Amino acid sequence: TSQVRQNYHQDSEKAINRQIRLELYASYVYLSMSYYFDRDDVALKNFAKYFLHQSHEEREHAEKLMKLQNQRGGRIFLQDIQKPDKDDWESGLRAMEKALKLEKKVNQSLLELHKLATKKNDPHLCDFIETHYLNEQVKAIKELGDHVTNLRKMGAPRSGLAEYLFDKHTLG
Amino acid sequence: TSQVRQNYHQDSEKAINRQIRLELYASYVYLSMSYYFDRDDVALKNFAKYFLHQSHEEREHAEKLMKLQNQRGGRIFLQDIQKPDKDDWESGLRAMEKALKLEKKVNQSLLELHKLATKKNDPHLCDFIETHYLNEQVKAIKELGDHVTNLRKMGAPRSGLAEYLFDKHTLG
Amino acid sequence: TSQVRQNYHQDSEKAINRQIRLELYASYVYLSMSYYFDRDDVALKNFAKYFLHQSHEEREHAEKLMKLQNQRGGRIFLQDIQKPDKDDWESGLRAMEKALKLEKKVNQSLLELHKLATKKNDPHLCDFIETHYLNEQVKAIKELGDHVTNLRKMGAPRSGLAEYLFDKHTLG
Amino acid sequence: TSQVRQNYHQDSEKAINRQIRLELYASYVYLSMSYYFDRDDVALKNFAKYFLHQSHEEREHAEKLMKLQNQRGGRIFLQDIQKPDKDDWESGLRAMEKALKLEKKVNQSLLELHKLATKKNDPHLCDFIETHYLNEQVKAIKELGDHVTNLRKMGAPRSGLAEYLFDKHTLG
Ligand SMILES: [Fe+3]
Ligand SMILES: [Fe+3]
Ligand SMILES: [Fe+3]
Ligand SMILES: [Fe+3]
Ligand SMILES: [Mg+2]
Ligand SMILES: [Mg+2]
What is the distance between the alpha carbons of residues D139 and A82, in angstroms, rounded to a whole number?
Answer: 74
Give the 3-state DSSP-derived string for chain D, with helices as H, strands as E and coil as C.
CCCCCCCCCHHHHHHHHHHHHHHHHHHHHHHHHHHHHCCCCCCCHHHHHHHHHHHHHHHHHHHHHHHHHHHCCCCCCCCCCCCCCCCCCCCHHHHHHHHHHHHHHHHHHHHHHHHHHHHCCCHHHHHHHHHHHHHHHHHHHHHHHHHHHHHHHHCCCCCHHHHHHHHHHCCC
Of B3, B71, B127, the CB nearest to D100: B3
What is the distance between the alpha carbons of residues D169 and D154, in angstroms, rounded to a whole number?
Answer: 12
Of B63, B76, B82, the CB nearest to C80: B82
> Contact B54/B23 with Cβ under 8 angstroms?
no
Q: CB contact, 8 Å: C3 with chain A?
A: yes
> Contact B12/C50 with Cβ under 8 angstroms?
no
Q: Which amino acid is at A36?
A: Y
B23 annotated binding-site participant: yes
Residue of C163, C164, C171 to mutate, testing the D interface (most D Cβ within 10 Å of its Cβ): C164
**Residue B93: HSE in the Cβ half-sphere, 13 Å Cα cutoff:** 17
Structural domain containing residue B46: 1-172
What is the chain B residue with the closest CA to D100?
Answer: B4
Residue of C41, C90, C166 to mutate, testing the D interface (most D Cβ within 10 Å of its Cβ): C41
Q: A131 phi and psi, to 5 degrees?
A: -70, -45
Of D140, D114, D86, which Cα lies nearest the Cα of D19?
A: D114
What is the distance between the alpha carbons of residues A104 and C6, in angstroms, rounded to a whole number?
Answer: 7
What is the distance between the alpha carbons of residues A14 and A11, in angstroms, rounded to a whole number?
Answer: 5
> Contact C43/D145 with Cβ under 8 angstroms?
yes
| Residues whose CB is less than 8 angstroms from the CB of residue C130 and which lie 6 or more positions away in sequence, other chains included | C114
- Do at least 3 CB pairs under 8 Å connect D with B? yes
Residue numbers in A near B164 (CB within 8 A): 150, 153-154, 165-166, 169
CATH number of the domain bearing residue A111: 1.20.1260.10
Count of C-beta atoms within a 10 Å radius of residue A32: 20
Of D110, C28, C38, D106, which Cα lies nearest the Cα of B69?
A: C38
Of D171, B81, B171, which Cα lies nearest the Cα of C84?
A: B81
CB contact under 8 A, A114 and C128: no
Protein residues near ligand 2, an ion, with CB under 5 A: B 23, 58, 61
DSSP conformation letters of B71-104? HHT-------BPPPS-S---SHHHHHHHHHHHHH
Of C67, C53, C55, which Cα lies nearest the Cα of C20?
A: C67
Count of C-beta atoms within a 10 Å radius of residue D137: 21
Residue numbers in B near A152 (CB within 8 A): 160
What is the distance between the alpha carbons of residues B51 and B41, in angstroms, rounded to a whole number?
Answer: 17
Bridge partners, C81 (sequence order): B81
Residue numbers in A near C124 (CB within 8 A): 130, 134-135, 137-138
What is the distance between the alpha carbons of residues D9 and D122, in angstroms, rounded to a whole number?
Answer: 8
Give the 3-state DSSP-derived string for chain A, with helices as H, strands as E and coil as C.
CCCCCCCCCHHHHHHHHHHHHHHHHHHHHHHHHHHHHCCCCCCCHHHHHHHHHHHHHHHHHHHHHHHHHHHHCCCCCCCCCCCCCCCCCCCHHHHHHHHHHHHHHHHHHHHHHHHHHHHCCCHHHHHHHHHHHHHHHHHHHHHHHHHHHHHHHHCCCCCHHHHHHHHHHCCC
Q: Residue C26 CA to chain centroid, in angstroms?
A: 5
Residue numbers in A near B41 (CB within 8 A): 145, 149
C63 annotated binding-site participant: no
Of A145, A155, A161, the CB nearest to B160: A155
DSSP-derived 3-state class of residue C81 = strand
Of C168, C159, B70, which Cα lies nearest the Cα of D145?
A: B70
How many angstroms separate the alpha carbon of residue B70 from the centre of ligand 4?
21
| Residues whose CB is less than 8 angstroms from the CB of residue D64 and which lie 6 or more positions away in sequence, other chains included | D132
Measure C130 CA to nearest chain A CA, in Å: 11
What is the distance between the alpha carbons of residues A86 and A32, in angstroms, rounded to a whole number?
Answer: 8
Q: CB contact, 8 Å: C27 with chain B?
A: no
Chains that touch B (3 or more CB pairs under 8 A): A, C, D
Q: What is the CA radius of gyration of chain A?
A: 18
Residue numbers in B near A169 (CB within 8 A): 164-165, 168
> Contact A148/B43 with Cβ under 8 angstroms?
no
What is the distance between the alpha carbons of residues A68 and A129, in angstroms, rounded to a whole number?
Answer: 10
Bridge partners, B81 (sequence order): C81
What is the distance between the alpha carbons of residues C71 and C58, in angstroms, rounded to a whole number?
Answer: 20
Measure C31 CA to nearest chain A CA, in Å: 32
Q: CB contact, 8 Å: A152 with chain B?
A: yes
CB contact under 8 A, A145 and C6: no
Technique of determination: X-ray
> Contact D32/D89 with Cβ under 8 angstroms?
yes
Task: Say whether the peptide bond before residue B157 is cis (omega within 30 degrees of 0).
Answer: yes
> Contact A50/A57 with Cβ under 8 angstroms?
no
First to last CA, chain B: 50
Residue numbers in A near B45 (CB within 8 A): 146
> Contact D46/D171 with Cβ under 8 angstroms?
yes
Q: What is the CA radius of gyration of chain D?
A: 18
Helix axis angle for D160-169 and D45-71, nearest 10°, is 60
Of B101, B73, B91, B87, which Cα lies nearest the Cα of B7?
A: B73
> Contact A155/A148 with Cβ under 8 angstroms?
no
How many angstroms separate the alpha carbon of residue C100 from the centre of ligand 3?
12
Give start and end residues of each alpha helix (H) in chain B.
Answer: 10-37, 45-72, 92-119, 123-129, 135-154, 160-169
What is the distance between the alpha carbons of residues C54 and C32, in angstroms, rounded to a whole number?
Answer: 11
Q: CB contact, 8 Å: B123 with chain A?
A: no
Structural domain tally of chain B?
1
What is the distance between the alpha carbons of residues C131 and D163, in angstroms, rounded to a whole number?
Answer: 48
How many angstroms separate the alpha carbon of residue A84 from the centre of ligand 4?
81
The alpha carbon dihedral of C46, C49, C53, C55 has a sign of: positive
CB contact under 8 A, A162 and B161: yes
- Alpha-carbon distances, residue B73 vs B5, B129, B145, C36 (angstroms): 5, 17, 38, 12
What is the chain C residue with the closest CA to B29?
Answer: C78
